[PDB]
């Protein structure tokens, strides 16, 4: 269960990994095969926003829907 304080103290090089491990299973529940791709897309967003998404299903849904729209337009 991730706070901003715990994430920011981790080495910048492992922060995205910590967020990914938490985001991927949440996304996989919506998109069972596209979860890795969508997670990769979302990981480019600021960590502050990503932390909010982990705690708020509605914010995560809206970002996932945005990634899927983008993928739909690229084949």
């Amino acid at each position: 269960p991730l706070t901003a304080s715990m994430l920011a103290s981790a080495p910048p090089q492992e922060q995205k990994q910590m967020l990914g491990e938490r985001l991927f299973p949440l996304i996989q529940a919506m998109h069972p095969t596209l979860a890795g791709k969508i997670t990769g897309m979302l990981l480019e967003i600021d960590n502050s926003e990503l932390l909010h998404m982990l705690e708020s299903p509605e914010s995560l849904r809206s970002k996932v829907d945005e990634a899927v729209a983008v993928l739909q337009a690229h084949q």
């Binding site: 979302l42 480019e44 990634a67």
Partner: peptide
């Protein structure tokens, strides 16, 4: 804006 070319996260490296 999100990037459609962002890499697949968590894909295992095997042969």
């Amino acid at each position: 804006e999100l990037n459609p070319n962002a890499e697949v996260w968590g894909a295992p490296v095997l042969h």
